[model samples]
Target: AMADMKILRTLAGYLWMRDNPEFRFRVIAALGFLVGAKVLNVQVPFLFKLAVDWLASATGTGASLTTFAATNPTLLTVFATPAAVLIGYGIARTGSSAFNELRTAVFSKVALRTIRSVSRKVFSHLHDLDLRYHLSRETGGLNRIIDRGSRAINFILSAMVFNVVPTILEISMVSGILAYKFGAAFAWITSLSVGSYIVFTLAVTQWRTKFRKAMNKADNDASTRAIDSLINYETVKYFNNEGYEAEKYDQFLKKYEDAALQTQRSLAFLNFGQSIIFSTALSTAMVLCSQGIMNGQMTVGDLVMVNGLLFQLSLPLNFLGSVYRETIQSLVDMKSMFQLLEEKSDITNTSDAKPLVLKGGNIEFENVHFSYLPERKILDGISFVVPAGKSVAIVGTSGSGKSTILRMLFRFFDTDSGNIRIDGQDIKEVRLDSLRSSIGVVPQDTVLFNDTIFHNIHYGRLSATEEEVYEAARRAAIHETISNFPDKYSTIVGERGLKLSGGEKQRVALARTFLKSPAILLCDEATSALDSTTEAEILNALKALASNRTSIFIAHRLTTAMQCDEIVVLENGKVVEQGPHDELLGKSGRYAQLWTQQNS
Candidate 1:
């Protein structure tokens, strides 16, 4: 634990020294306090020897107590010098400790900036990662890793670096002083004390490391179970599987408990051995000191100094165990962070990728072919063109690659073969951030945050004014709905918008898109859950908003399809027919067949 804390000390030094030169005053103050405290620690044992010699000589040897004093004889005459020095040192050490704590507090606060920057990089990279990568990983798991990694910075700064190493250095200095005065006997005593501590710590800490890893596994399990329960609470309650969920949660809890208990048991065994080793080393030193006294080789003053030094030595032995344990544990905590750092994002900009500037929202797909997997083709040579300032509807049965086209446009999955262009700029050449920012999508089922309605609507344009948000909400038909709530715009939607009806959530989603006003608007059966009246209102509002924008609307309803400037009929990953609704109806082809069937 002390070693890990030493790492934290080094971390703190590096953080304060390398980063903010302005905070040098605080660092200097802390260092001053630290050095003063350390000097006081050294003076403590020396003072004990001084007091012992003075008392011994004053009683006998016909010498004045002042004769043993290093400083003014009058000072020793008026005061018990050792007691006074000790009290002063104690006070100074405490003041120094406070300074160290203050410095660490400042260091921790600054580390947050680093954590936030790291989080932003991770979040941005996550967005750019391929869809399959997301599908394979759990959302809660990833979030927990990042959050835990951020918090570990404190331990990495405080315990490992500043306190532990300095304490060890103090031990070495004290041991060297004793060896200089005494010889091989005292030297061997110090060496043996340090050796026993290291060997015992190494063995116990190795076992502790395995336990720490198991504990982390338990934490991951608990997080997974809890997130699963919360995310699917409705489904669990609907099926009255609360008991089953609880039982499943209980199972995970058992694993967590078992791992923790195992750690506790291992530590208990280590503590037992530590007690034995510590007591034995001290006893051996005492016996050796008594033998020296019997041989007339050591005085009472020397014995007293040895005892003080032994007490000082105990600090290092205790902290050595602490450092060993913490070093292992800190590394274990870093496992997830290292794994995250190693990950490579799939949707990053290539060296030659150019920035996409939207002049108009015209989109062109030429000989497009794509498959999410090798055996299942999603879009097969699907060719289409949405001319600038035109609304195009993709009408087809489910799984006919209608929605896939919208997904493909965003490069959520790269096409197996083909050229896709936005405003005559090839998508492969465009920077993803610029390309995606120009397009707005509203799916059939919309997801909303648990935040206030105002915040939810403002997500479309973060810097938009209240009036702007209200106007977008009005267009999406959620303005009135929000008004009916007690807090109106301030009212929270609750988790996943469970507080509101499906239509309400959809309107909120549409409101966001309405405010964004991207040049290209993509919809996936956006109004499917609404009644005809509500659908008509939404479609009309969308049409007015999409007049100058390139709209790619996916719909199964013939009524919705009829409003589009052009319609494409898709079947089995292929574009079967393409034309305006009137022209397609006249031809009596796939579009006509679907149109006739829906009308019938």
Candidate 2:
């Protein structure tokens, strides 16, 4: 139990307090209040014992308040009488509750602020993660992990600072008070009963956790199915697979129902087990206590105090049980976060990295070799170069690694072996942030945030003025089309830019790239999603965009290939042909066959 909270202490000790110097004031104040709250809390039962003892004579003889106080003065003259003692009990109760709440008020900012800082790093780290890593992971699990982790951090902090410390102090004070008044026997009996309850709960809770885990898994499945179906609502409608999805959803719910039922059953057993242990303890104590009082060996106050302390101790009986479970649960929840924070990114800037120095955007890929899977090569010994301010087209079959080359240039994944250079500088050795910021890439799929067209286009150059955005839009040839919309640039693109047509989305993307005005641009089948006419329009705009910049086009059309200054044809991950457009056709190789395949 102590060790579990130790992790919490260290978690915050290292993360929170180390970074935020101002939080120490609140931490100290919260600790003081925690101690004050426990002190007032434990002393309340003691006040109750005094109130009852003093009221004894008033019960039968109806003794006056003055007479009772003067007659019974054993400890500190015991301060006033039954009325004062009773009032003192009320004050202590109120003060204890107030102090507890006060601590929470002061400490909450610390808890929340710490999580805020940690979460910022998490978001930053998630971005720093390899893009390839995100390919295999879903947004669903990512959100779940971070959400649970945030809650877990706050819970552990509150439990340790407020609940755990206060409970232990309350227990010790009650037990010691019982021991001082009665023999150690009463203290041990209460301790054993509480101990028995905790250990029993520990074992049962461990067993029950499995059922809870099972339920959680199915719960996730049900949520996943619902979300996936909703996300692919169009697909479901297109295929008329609503019934199939509903059936899958029903299976997810069925598993959840079974697991939840088992969890409830186990919980009931543990509750009953705890009641049995504590019931035996209190009854036996009452028996012995009554005998001693009747035999004149003990005062009613001693019996009353003993009972009061034992009763007070039982309050935390169930509290400790839940606390124990929660501590373990919180630790489990944060395990992934700890591992995540420790994880190093596959791609990061070297220690000696400097910003990329662009010299007319000269580009080279020399002896590049890479494999998505160890056994199957994607880019095998790829070698190419485009002179400064020139354009090159890479035409290849789908799996021949045309796009893979672009992915490599962006450092989404490092090559197995080989070096890529921009302006005679090795890309791998340059600052990744600087390298990417210098280049523009327009991919086949143009996904956008659910924001207005103005916002999406402005994303290309966040610092650009509104007029500049309109200028880029005009250059991309989408300005007049956007002007026709009722809201023009303010029109919302909808999810993933789904509201826009293929051509419009690509044009919006081009407007963004043009706004960036990078010295080098890479277009990976950028016009593939558009119609032949739309494709030609965008390609023509792209050609203009690349006229004074180095550019690479991964193309599927002969027209785009012919438009480029140089063409490279790839076969089996190897460049089998390369030359000027007319020179490539002169060879009548793969390049000629492609024209025949499309033309026929």
Candidate 3:
């Protein structure tokens, strides 16, 4: 099924070649350069023969051909005042390279822009992807995907359009020239040897691609190990794991060194095979030329010209195998990237979707059933309600999947069954951004972007004025604390909010939420990261914030649930109990049992 994808995939509809305007201009120019380079390349071989012919006439040495063919690396010419023919030969070679570089320059924009556009399209698509997709993802660790995939796109274009096509043209032209000047024998010998070289080289190169993949895997593993541990060294230090990474890193490096050795051996084998094939071809071609001169038919210049043509073919032919192999691998690697671009966002706004019509801040879940994996349920026919202007607590032990309630209300995901309604609007029918914008959350851990504290708080509502940000911070009891800092509001908090304390980060989070003044509020274990005094301070601010708004809490401490209008005890993906915390007490129920340890 995927096999036909390469054609439908690589053709005009999906591929870069015919997709853009101004394409024909570049393609035609690149073609012009291609023909120019090949002409110069073929001409180059003739110069050597011409230069040698002039030298042969002057020297008039009968053994001259036999003399140089046997030995003398530089004795191919053996020239004179007409030794300046070497200048023309050198210039033609330079001209070929110059045209090739110009071809690259002309076509590079087409190659670079398409991949560049494809990469960015996928980058933004990642953001549009569902929350579930992100949860299962690795660090967007996707930069490598884009970087390598982008480079591969360019290389494949270069190999296909420039390298592979031109090599074919050159080989065919040389074959044609040989048959026209000499005989079919000379043409047949060159073609057979070239074909033999290709088969052997392609097979050997494909076999060694296995070794290269191992190298990539080993290198990626080694690199991720050092960098991953390097970023989390604070905990590594906390646990006295200073040498743990050293031991682990050494193993990956050892594997890499092993794979590296295998790659070298494989490379040696390929090179050896290639060398034998071409050298034999040259020798046989030379013999045919030698025997012709032995008779009355050919001359010394025929042998020199054959040598020149074969030698010219060698350079491009040598890389032909590798370029083909690389392009093959590039095609395989880009499959996922191409599919990612084709990925329809798992969650999307409905065509009929409208902004949530706020009747009130009330939210209700009607017999919702949801699961991340099909086999295991997170919310199973679970139902709950927060009436307009009320706060409720969602409390359960670890693995209880209590946090899923908050995630669902935010519509980060859709329920597998039933529905979550806010102010009588089915969340899925309402615009997702508008739904999310109506609520504010203060989470357990806050990782601020690398920016100033002022900007961090301003993130809540970008349109909020400086005075509004100041007011929100003042109300959260953080404005003066920020003011006491050396840079005050301008102090850079940096990533992970490392420059601030856990308590301080919570207040910043609270300040951010306050700026939003959302119709509904959520604090999921908002103070769990802080000590009791800080927790009490945070609870005071939250209690005030929740007074006249619809709010939900996933309390890390069960006691924090005591003040809510209702407490929800979820067990086995169902609500095991629901009531005020005090009323549920002394019953030895799930919440009562959970509260025992925290009480102690």
lDDT against the true structure, per candidate, is 0.71, 0.76, 0.77
Question: lDDT at 102 for candidate 3?
Answer: 90
lDDT of 2 by residue, 39-120 (tens): 7777777677767764666656645554534343456544665677777788889998899789889888778888898899
TM-score winner among the candidates? 2
Model 2 residue 206 lDDT score: 77
Task: Supply the global lDDT for candidate 1.
Answer: 0.71
Separate clash counts for every candidate: 22, 0, 0
Against the hidden reference, what TM-scores do the models get?
Answer: 0.77, 0.82, 0.75
For model 3, the stretches where C-alpha displacement exceeds 4 angstroms are 1-14, 17-20, 47-89, 136-148, 178-180, 203-273, 287-303, 322-329, 339-350, 371-385, 396-400, 463-465, 484-489, 495-498, 568-600
Ranking by TM-score: 2, 1, 3
Q: List the residue pairs that clash in candidate 3.
A: none
- The TM-score that candidate 2 achieves is 0.82
Tens digits of per-residue lDDT for model 1, 1-600: 555556445444445545567557655665565566565666666656655565556556745634433453355432555466557546654665565456556555455665666568667877756787888989998878777766675565566546676676676676676544567566767777777777888777878878889899889989987997799878887887777778888889988988888888898998888778777877877787788778777345566666666676666556555566555556656555655654776665678867777777777889988777888878778777778888888888775756676677778877667888777878877788787887888877777767877787788877999788767766676646555777645766777553777666676777778888787778888666567767677667777887877788888777665778788887777888788788888888777878788777
**lDDT-based ranking:** 3, 2, 1
